[PDB]
Amino acid sequence: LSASATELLQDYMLTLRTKLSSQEIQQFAALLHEYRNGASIHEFCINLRQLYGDSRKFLLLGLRPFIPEKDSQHFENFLETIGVKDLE
Amino acid sequence: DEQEALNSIMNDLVALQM
């Protein structure tokens, strides 16, 4: 884990602490843990979208480097599809 | 439990790379 990845991780955790409610933190922890234990990237994206909707764009963009290589393309397609990079 | 959830999140984020 590089120094830059370390920085990104710290930044992400801080942003989570600043932005999310206890409930949101619990839900994200749950769905992320499910994905970590072997659940599909598809279900991960569904759960993320159900959690954030069109909001929390920063937190979705920040996940991209963390997505495993084999699931990265699906995640990018997801972000592009739901319009995370589209402000208006 | 919120702190534990945060620790879980960080741990899982690291684990996805390992």
What is the DSSP code string of chain A?
--HHHHHHHHHHHHHHHHH--HHHHHHHHHHHHHHHTT--HHHHHHHHHHHHTT--HHHHHTTGGGS-GGGHHHHHHHHHHHTTT---
What is the DSSP secondary structure assignment for residue B18, as one 8-state letter? Answer: -
Number of domains in chain A: 1
CA distance A87 to chain B (A): 27
∠ CA A3-A18-A53, rounded to 5°: 100
Rounded to whole angstroms, how far apart are CA atoms B6 and B11? 9
In contact, A49 and A82? CB cutoff 8 Å: yes
Residue A8: CATH number of its domain = 1.20.1160.20
CA distance B9 to chain A (A): 5
- Cβ-Cβ contacts under 8 Å, A16 against chain B: 6, 9
Structural domain span for residue A73: 1-88
Tell me the structure's resolution in angstroms, rounded to a single decimal.
2.1
